Design a protein around this ligand. Structure first.
Ligand code: HEM
Ligand SMILES: C[C@@H]1C[C@H](N(C)C)[C@@H](O)[C@H](OC2CCCCCCCCCCC2)O1
Length: 396
């Protein structure tokens, strides 16, 4: 079986990748491909198998188990809980699990509500009643919340939309590398700027942790932890809010239902995650030994991508999978992963999305998509499902 080239597709595959994935699931669970970027990885498709592989400790997240080389810039950033296995994963996550529980997150609700209120105020002041939702709300909300939590100064934040329109979605390989180096350079200087200043933000608390005992949180892990916590939502929450609003605006009858009964709101957010969540493939996994998936043997050290998008379109698990239905049973979706690496930010992502979605519906009369779906442009990236821009309008 050849290597299916996804850069060849090309296309087209950016707009709607799903039939490709379903086409593979038909044959079997595991498939060699080459990305638009051009790397040889395995894809794992189909719900049951995707779910199992996410939580299977035969598939490592530690790059020591991978045969793929890292650049120096990549390596500088990889001492984080997501690119670790137990016991390191266990020790790292314990350092911040208390910060991110539902109940600690619930305390942020007034402030999140306040940030959204202000962003929409600003949005609604447009004379023509037209906006790009990505710029006015989807981007600035998550960055503002996570920057306050971690103590990134307001003037420093604009650089991050630049670095992420690079780490996450490049446009040139060397420039993703440059972005990485600059980001790491900056986070290191930010870390140093907290020392001895008695800050109460999370980054200042992590600095003292590391300084009190380097075996509990090394200086590399400290930088890794700042990095992962900061990037995670720039790539994800931004896209859930934009993909989800697009979902709703492009299924007017679901929008109408949600307007008629806002108690449906949490369920609608879940179905935005199921139908078009931002993570289309989970982060890299590395078999620690050959792994046989229904007669396909994945060799030790190869790159394995769990395709969450396909799992979410598996009809035996999610009937009429292509229907966006805000009242669907979404229980068991994979949009936040599964197993020891299950999303730590999930309560915070859900709080930000639920508040943003509610504010839009409540405050934008006759909110509409302001281009046809066919004119929207999705990033070519097959790991992150995200839009370049989301034009909307409302009645002024
Ligand atoms: C809608 C928004 C979000 C989505 C869809 C999402 C999705 C995910 C997924 C799928 C994973 C598992 C990756 C894998 O197994 O390969 C994950 C892990 C992780 N997420 Fe989230 N995420 C979101 C928001 C956030 C936010 C806001 C934060 C930071 C507060 C965050 C921090 C992390 C961290 C640190 C991990 C690694 C956890 C571990 O390895 O134990 N995420 N996320
Ligand atoms: C550590 C990984 C390595 C990948 N690589 C090509 C440099 C990158 O795309 C990924 O993604 C970001 C956010 C985008 C993927 C979201 C998956 C779940 C969020 C957890 C944080 C990962 C960081 O960070």
């Amino acid at each position: 079986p050849p290597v299916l080239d996804l850069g060849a597709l090309g296309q087209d595959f950016a707009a709607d990748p799903y039939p490709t994935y379903a086409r593979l699931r038909a044959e079997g669970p595991a498939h060699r491909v080459r990305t638009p970027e051009g790397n040889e990885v395995w894809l794992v498709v189909g719900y049951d198998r995707a779910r199992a592989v996410l939580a299977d400790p035969r598939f490592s997240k530690d790059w020591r188990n991978s045969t793929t080389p890292l650049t120096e810039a990549e390596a500088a950033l990889n001492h984080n809980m997501l690119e670790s296995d137990p016991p390191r994963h266990t020790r790292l996550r314990k350092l911040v699990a208390r910060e991110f529980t539902m109940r600690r997150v619930e305390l942020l609700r007034p402030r999140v509500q306040e940030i959204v209120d202000g962003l929409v105020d600003a949005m609604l002041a447009a004379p023509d009643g037209r906006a790009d939702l990505m710029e006015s709300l989807a981007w600035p909300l998550p960055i503002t919340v996570i920057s306050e939590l971690l103590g990134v100064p307001e003037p420093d934040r604009a650089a991050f939309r630049v670095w992420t329109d690079a780490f996450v979605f490049p446009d040139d390989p060397a420039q993703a590398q440059t972005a990485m180096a600059e980001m790491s350079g900056y986070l290191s200087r930010l870390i140093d700027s907290k020392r001895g200043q008695d800050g109460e933000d999370l980054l200042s608390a992590l600095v003292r942790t590391s300084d009190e005992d380097g075996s509990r949180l090394t200086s590399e892990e400290l930088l890794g932890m700042a990095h992962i916590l900061l990037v995670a939502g720039h790539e994800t929450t931004v896209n859930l809010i934009a993909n989800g609003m697009y979902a709703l605006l492009s299924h007017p009858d679901q929008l109408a239902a949600l307007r008629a009964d806002m108690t449906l709101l949490d369920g609608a957010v879940e179905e935005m995650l199921r139908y078009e969540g931002p993570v289309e493939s989970a982060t890299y996994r590395f078999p620690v030994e050959p792994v046989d998936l229904d007669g396909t043997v994945i060799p030790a050290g190869d790159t394995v991508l769990v395709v969450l998008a396909d799992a979410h379109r598996t009809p035996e698990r999610f009937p009429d999978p292509h229907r966006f239905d805000i009242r669907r049973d979404t229980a068991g979706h994979l949009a936040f992963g599964h197993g020891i690496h299950f999303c730590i930010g999930a309560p915070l992502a859900r709080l930000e999305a639920r508040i943003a979605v509610r504010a839009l519906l409540e405050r934008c009369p006759d909110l509409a998509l302001d281009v046809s779906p066919g004119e929207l442009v999705w990033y070519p990236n097959p790991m992150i499902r995200g839009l370049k821009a989301l034009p909307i309008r409302w009645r002024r």
